Design an enzyme around this catalytic site. Structure first.
Site: not given
Ligand SMILES: [Ca+2]
Ligand SMILES: CC(=O)N[C@@H]1[C@@H](O)[C@H](O)[C@@H](CO)O[C@H]1O
Ligand SMILES: CC(=O)N[C@@H]1[C@@H](O)[C@H](O)[C@@H](CO)O[C@H]1O
Ligand SMILES: CC(=O)N[C@@H]1[C@@H](O)[C@H](O)[C@@H](CO)O[C@H]1O
Ligand SMILES: CC(=O)N[C@@H]1[C@@H](O)[C@H](O)[C@@H](CO)O[C@H]1O
Ligand SMILES: C[C@@H]1O[C@@H](O)[C@@H](O)[C@H](O)[C@@H]1O
Ligand SMILES: C[C@@H]1O[C@@H](O)[C@@H](O)[C@H](O)[C@@H]1O
Ligand SMILES: C[C@@H]1O[C@@H](O)[C@@H](O)[C@H](O)[C@@H]1O
Ligand SMILES: C[C@@H]1O[C@@H](O)[C@@H](O)[C@H](O)[C@@H]1O
Ligand SMILES: [Ca+2]
Ligand SMILES: [Ca+2]
Ligand SMILES: [Ca+2]
Ligand code: NI
Ligand code: NI
Ligand code: NI
Ligand code: NI
Lengths: 388, 388, 388, 388
Positions: A211-212, A242, A288, A36, A195-196, A216, A322, A69-70
């Site tokens: 990324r919001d 986005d 996506r 990923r 983010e990211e 947003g 992504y 994930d983590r």
């Molecule tokens: Ca957003």
């Protein structure tokens, strides 16, 4: 010698296919990590694809997506660009469930974030060993770009977030030289969410399109100077990039505020082109799926809806994911400017498809002086697999 | 040029995750050696993981653990740190059922012990060829560290044992330059037992923290000067770090004598920090489960019980194993001191688990200037495997 | 330094076996790409085999030949000559369903053509990154050599076609320096057809022997000077070397016009030897079976039928395929001339054989000062495979 | 720079284990070539294992031993010493069903013999490309050493045979510089037979101990000077070292003539030690089982039976095979002499064992200044395999 990376970004008319790894197709029989967040970054000699693994291979029982994930098994590894993320060509980089990497002209710097959500540890590696650390400052999933960091004049820059995924968090930008952290700055961004970040060098500064994940549907934009002064706002353009987002018709841009009143998001990117902007986005507004790149006249500085170029990279019938930015160094291109490139992650598997696993493959495009025809370099794997 | 390695060891406040290889998880489908005794050692350009194989792979019938530990198939091989011990990335080092390895700044030196128990032969390799040998001097399983040896000013040092595993044996330290043995010394240690030393350079000497398999639950400490004069005793600290051991409450330290009246043991390590000490140990007192590292004030020089730091690396619900020490060279860190690192072997399989095989994977941590949160980077493999 | 490649081609009396990769035999169990169009090209240090993959492996379900030839999964990769096209030794080169590659003395240049049939994009890579592009100029499957391009004095030359596969198309030759296109020329060739040119340097020019897929059973010949002036015609020799072709008895050569009135063809090659010529051809006149190489006296300049040497490389009972030319650089041979080499693709699978897949392996021969005995270095794989 | 290799061979008291590849054990699950004739040769930086493959892997159907020994699929490949002959670490060398290889200080020279029995072609490769050829001069299976050739002062020497396997044949020694043949000599040896020479440099000459497959149970000895003058005879020692052979009691040595009146043989080796000799042989007199090495006082020059050392390397309960000689270069050992090493092939499979396949693994030993204990580093694979 250190890479200067002080040049302006090249103004490009389209993007040419650089690489396609076919990792999932290959992994039907070959020994390929389930991955990923696969980003690309380049040194003066080569571009590499970085990725997060779980220590599990496609078509094996450990690819069973019942893990966190983590997780403690998650690591950052890399291969040469265009190679599948296979076991026998992979270079280990860091223990990590969030990461960034970049080359300063001399060595690779890698940041891997691991540890518990309440107290994560981000380890900075330089030249293949640990050199420094940043512990969580806000106790809520310290995390970073999942794409190339940016090095200018031997100093490397990146952005991290610590706090909630769905409301106000805290954001910091860091500066390191030779794997040693030598500066940081709190990013003041009330009402905004970062983010990211997808970052790249342009005219001696670090430009970031992020990324919001709070309210947003437009993307934050962060511009960092080497003395860690900064400008922060939103991508001015009157088109949103986005996902999820609303219809273009219903959207009015803002340079200063989140617009659209929707949660969630996807990692994406944009490139400044003087006062214009290239912006990537999924073709679908809700999922996506598909990927297109749009050039908007004056889109970096005004709420413009004047689209002047559009290129399709993945058709709307296929899965994307992504996407992120990087540049080609002058020591490779011999150009007078930094060439903009991007990668697109194409996610396959659960929950959208009926498999026990989830992984992704990639397509990578670089900016050129010519318009390039629409097409679809989609993943191509036939699911389900044997293990399913 | 030769590595000087004459600097003091760095004083560190915690340890950051360096690498995790996920070898057993990967080997469910990939082609990974069944291994034991996986240590790390570093050259001026990279750190490598060394390991003992039987020429058998995970999930194959040859992984059937019906062999002698000290078999004629056993060899020493290596990969880059963080790579699984897989066939296609492996570098051959030596024929060996006991081993040590270290880099002198110019080339790798490796020592592999093989042959019969009554008359074993330890072959010294330098630069990838055999350069010298040591035959058994006491006719009872000549054996060595199973971790990095130590090079200072172009001369490399290591410790070997020849004799009983459960009562008085004999112990020698050796010195080599460019793969040629140029000195040795008998270690006088009556009433004491030394196995599997974990050594590192500190202030121009070789400090070693070893395993007493006879009566001691505290660890021997051996300090070797370049002229092969030495000091030998026990780790002073009023906490014991062998396994099996007694409760901390019931334990009083000694600088000079074994304490605890228990047999057996596990390979472990400790780092001097001025007069303090970092010491590793399993969390369980009775089994090789969990792993923690404790800093004890004045623990190198007094029978102190003043614990000032504790960090958990593997939780007590998961299997650990051997652990060992190494340092990061100045040519990599650019520091004024030698950075302490350690690895932890995490054993899986028989007899504790119902499989026909036994192997291990590793986590590697390096010292940093910051406290790091507890977590568990445990092995993660789901047993049994197909071959079972 | 740049390769001069200005020397004359060596006059050779026969060809010696260079390499055989056994890729299909190996791929019965190993992890080997399903490939097509496997050519060889050499740098000052090594020769490499280039090949087109679909991201699918032999004996996997993705090898199912239900795809478009010109699919979005198709990429160009390479290995060292004689290595099977296996996943774990492969170097990524370009996204491509048509390709050419060559080394200029400093770096590899690769051209990969991908995208839609109506508007394909040919991406030029130099040193492992994209440096330039050529879009389709005639909107009908832009395509190129499928063999080594030719570099002389640091400038690299290749030939492309855009237009119909079975009637008049358009043909252009290009020139690049350091991955930047710096010249091109339209090849005027009315009544003629050029595909899949096999080129090599000779006396400071690029000589090419190509495929006529329209009406010719003799091969086009194209000679390009560094200023992009050119001579174009047909291989004069009174023996035809395309497949399909007629009987030698029924054939009269022409220096200027296609002869034979047959469609289709196969990629092949020829080498000028002063005024003589070495020409390759399938032994079968109707199918791609067997491979022989013939030397014809004065065959480059007259319609001669004077055969002076013949060597069999694959017997007529076994499958052949495409074949192509390259040269060994002086920096490797230390000769006063450029040594001619060729490769022969040996195709296996559908539709001629009852499998779901199609791939190929290769034999490579180089020119020597001695006659060499006939033999057959055929593929050797036993079909069908498990997946069938 | 060229390797001088003009030094005397070291006088050694025993042999230490260098490497063991465990190739067959690994190939139960890993992807390992089925091999034969695995020799070792060293460059100034490393030793490599060379081997002949059929393009087939262990546990695959193509490993079915129904092929010609001298097939068109047979190739020479190499790996680093101690690596299994696996697909993904293998370097291609030559097309070959008979081979030799050696390094001159600058590049690898390889000779691969392929083609038909009546007219074979031996191709000389230098630096990874073909540079010259030798065709069969007697029309009856041209063939060579199957072990390291010998380079002295930049010129490389090897021995070939052309003619019958069971009666008088013809024998030639060749000399090459940079892959170009620059001299040869017919070896006059009436009544004698030479196959599969094991050669090494000693005092500026090439000493060879070969195989007589006609009537001799003692081994031919051939000593070649750089001007291609030579001495040829038999190993004087009053112990025989071929297999099959008679009992030592029944044997009287000869410096000049074959002794024993038996056909067949096995490739083996011997090292001159002043006037003494180290000689290898199978422990069994009748089968290729076990391996021992004997030092005989004055055995190079007299028909001595004075055994002064004996070392067992493979016990008599396990299979051995071919064995051969090489030396460690001074640029690796830093010695004043050339260190003698040997390898032993351990054959497994048909017809002696009930499998469809035959392959081999290896043990490699190097000379040291110490006596080394007997042991058995036998193959270790458990047959039959799955494919059986
Ligand atoms: Ca957003
Ligand atoms: C094919 C496979 O492994 N399926 C398993 C399933 O049986 C199990 O319920 C789940 C959670 O353990 O993980 C998955
Ligand atoms: C799965 C497997 O191989 N099991 C075997 C078992 O049948 C045998 O009794 C033992 C000793 O030979 O080795 C193990
Ligand atoms: C062995 C195999 O995969 N066979 C399939 C076949 O069932 C299918 O009809 C065809 C088209 O989808 O592709 C092929
Ligand atoms: C397991 C296997 O492949 N066995 C085959 C056998 O059936 C056949 O008779 C022989 C010759 O073709 O080759 C072998
Ligand atoms: C998360 C997984 O689901 C449950 C069990 O079947 C497994 O052991 C694992 O704990
Ligand atoms: C130790 C093993 O156990 C017994 C036999 O089943 C095997 O052949 C092997 O000897
Ligand atoms: C071309 C192939 O044939 C049809 C289907 O069975 C597959 O999904 C694929 O579309
Ligand atoms: C030699 C082998 O034996 C027979 C046949 O079963 C095979 O096709 C092969 O020819
Ligand atoms: Ca103990
Ligand atoms: Ca034609
Ligand atoms: Ca004989
Ligand atoms: Ni590269
Ligand atoms: Ni590295
Ligand atoms: Ni090479
Ligand atoms: Ni090496």
């Amino acid at each position: 010698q250190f890479m200067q990376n002080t040049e302006a970004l090249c103004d490009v008319k389209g993007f040419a296919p650089f690489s396609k790894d076919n990792g999932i197709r290959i992994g039907s029989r070959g020994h390929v990590f389930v991955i990923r967040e696969p980003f690309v970054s380049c040194s003066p000699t080569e571009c590499r694809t970085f990725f997060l693994t779980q220590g599990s291979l496609l078509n094996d029982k450990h690819s069973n997506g019942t893990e966190k994930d983590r997780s403690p098994y998650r690591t950052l590894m890399s291969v040469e660009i265009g190679q599948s993320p296979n076991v026998y060509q992979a270079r280990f980089e860091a223990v990590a469930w969030s990461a960034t990497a970049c080359h300063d002209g001399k060595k690779w710097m890698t940041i891997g974030v691991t540890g518990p959500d309440a107290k994560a540890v981000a380890v900075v590696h330089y030249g293949g060993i640990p050199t420094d650390v940043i512990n969580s400052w806000a106790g809520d999933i310290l995390r970073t770009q999942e794409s190339s960091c940016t090095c200018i004049l031997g100093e490397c820059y990146w952005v991290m977030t610590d706090g909630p995924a769905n409301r106000q968090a805290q954001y910091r930008a860091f500066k390191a030289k030779q794997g040693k952290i030598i500066g940081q700055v709190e990013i003041s961004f009330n009402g905004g969410h970062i983010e990211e970040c997808s970052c790249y060098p342009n005219d001696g500064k670090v430009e970031c399109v992020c990324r919001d994940n709070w309210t947003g549907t437009n993307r934050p934009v962060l511009v960092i100077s080497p003395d860690l002064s900064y400008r922060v706002g939103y991508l001015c353009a009157g088109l949103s990039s986005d996902t999820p987002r609303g219809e273009d018709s219903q959207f009015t841009g803002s340079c200063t505020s989140p617009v659209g009143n929707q949660g969630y998001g996807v990692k994406g990117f944009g490139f400044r082109q003087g006062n214009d902007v290239w912006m990537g986005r999924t073709i679908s507004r809700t999922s996506r799926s598909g990927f297109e790149i749009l050039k908007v006249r004056n889109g970096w500085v005004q709420t413009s809806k004047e689209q002047i170029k559009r290129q399709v990279v993945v058709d709307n019938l296929n899965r994307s994911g992504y996407s992120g930015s990087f540049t080609l160094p002058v020591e490779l291109t011999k150009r007078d400017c930094l060439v903009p490139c991007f990668w697109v992650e194409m996610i396959r598997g659960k929950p959208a498809e009926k498999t026990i696993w989830t992984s992704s493959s990639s397509i990578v495009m670089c900016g050129v002086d010519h318009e390039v025809a629409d097409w679809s370099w989609h993943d191509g794997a036939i699911l389900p697999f044997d293990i399913d």
